[PDB]
């Protein structure tokens, strides 16, 4: 019993960890095989980074201006290429450290743990979610580029974030492991509009469901509720309208306990329609949105 | 900028976990040189857990009856040995991943990352604090029993904890490394009572300094107290009594930031006084105690 905010264990990623430098800047790379993947603002200065021609800025770049140092041994860099907004290092050698890895690119409402990291060297993780608006809510400061995103299958690491920038509203934004940012996201020291963000509704019901799993069941009610009512409680909270797909995903947890996916959803519109009362659940007095229903199922099976 | 409860990268704990086995019961054990530590209940059989004498049950246990398999290889037992009550198995083989390490004794109010685990594999791993009662407020299943919590200094590991029962209130209480637990519980089947637990002040405190340095500045008031004014408010909301050494701790967020500490105080007695009206700080609707002021300070600094 409890419930937490539990990331995945991060040794195999910290093993992958290595700290990229060109010129003045300094950030973090991700090691896997013989290639060094980093943001490719590692090769801009100050006055680049408002506007930066990023193809005119990497010509001027040799192998050599690649410093690349895991711990304290230092890698041969014997080729760079830039894909989209990641520059990969060719290294004359293989990580010896590389664990079975995919990368993968997660859907907004899905879940990652992120191993913040500077010059190389890892700090701490914490879990967290992609935002319905593709930024994530996390916790880097000055020289956690290319700090990873990941989640962890048996033995295998999708990797699917790599952190680039914080907006001016303090958020993050990051690409995938191919370069691509999440969102309209530009790696431009440039004000950017995130969207209207929404809360993860099939998650918040996943969260119920490991409330009432865990002994918290205060909130259950005498109700029920359809889709489209529940759809319309969930339009004026900025709540993600609820699917099919949604109450097939929670399928699982709805037959765990027995209570209905509707049911469920009954006691989620009296909860957004009436507050909290003073009252908490899992220990948060809010609506909590960054555990999916695959977390719950795991967290409340115990799957290593 | 951001603030995240963020556990330590777990990459060096990982290394260490194995599985044990004692008859029918499988726990994980803390593989350190050629030493496996387990909790000592792992000897006994359901009938035995309500009232166990381990003296007795250890006396007809032998080096071959406990199992002990790190990954898929299997450790050979050269001795046994009760302390407190964890066990200690000497192995024929140092481990080759045993990190630097200390064991210590944490107080109640401190924090720790737990890496919970399972038949020997790690699971995930989260941040929490020893409450000023003893218990923590963990999440583990039945087998997450000799899971442990760590702190990580530079490459030092200082183990703290090892998880041994949850309680019939759900709450989970565990040892030190040298088998003491931290409360006045015992390793038997039995109601036991957990002290009447307080939130932890300093804590408080320290997290509104991080509220402060990441842009929620709303709790801030035109007020001030002195420490016995806010000493009466903490009793009424069964806080801990702020001392002087809790303000000397709180010295470097007072001084990066400019707010006296008495000052913090009188913010956070309105907040006690008067909730926080439908708002939030730093994404949580309550306050949070489970950040000391060295968590704070390291996470925004970004000590790795
Ligand atoms: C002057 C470089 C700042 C860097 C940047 O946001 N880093 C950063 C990341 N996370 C937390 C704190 C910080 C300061 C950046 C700005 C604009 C666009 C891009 Cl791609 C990068
Ligand atoms: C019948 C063994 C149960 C075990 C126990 O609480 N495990 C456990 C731990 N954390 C979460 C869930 C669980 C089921 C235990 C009970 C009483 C005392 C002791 Cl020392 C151990």
Redesign the interface.
Known sequence: ???????????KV??CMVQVTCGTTTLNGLWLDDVVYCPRHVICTSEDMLNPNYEDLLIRKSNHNFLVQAGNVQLRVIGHSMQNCVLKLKVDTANPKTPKYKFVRIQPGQTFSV?????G??????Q?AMRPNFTI????????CGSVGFNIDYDCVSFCYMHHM?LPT???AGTDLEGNFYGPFVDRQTAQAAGTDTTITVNVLAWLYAAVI??DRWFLNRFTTTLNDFNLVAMKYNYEPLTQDHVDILGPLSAQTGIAVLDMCASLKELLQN??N?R?IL????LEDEFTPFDVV???????
């Open positions: 019993s409890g419930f937490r905010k539990m990331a995945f264990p991060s040794g910290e093993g191993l913040a990291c500077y010059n060297s890892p700090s701490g993780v914490y967290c809510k996390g916790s880097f400061l000055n020289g956690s914080e303090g958020v993050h865990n002994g507050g909290m003073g908490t220990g948060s007095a809010l795991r967290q409340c099976s115990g799957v290593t």
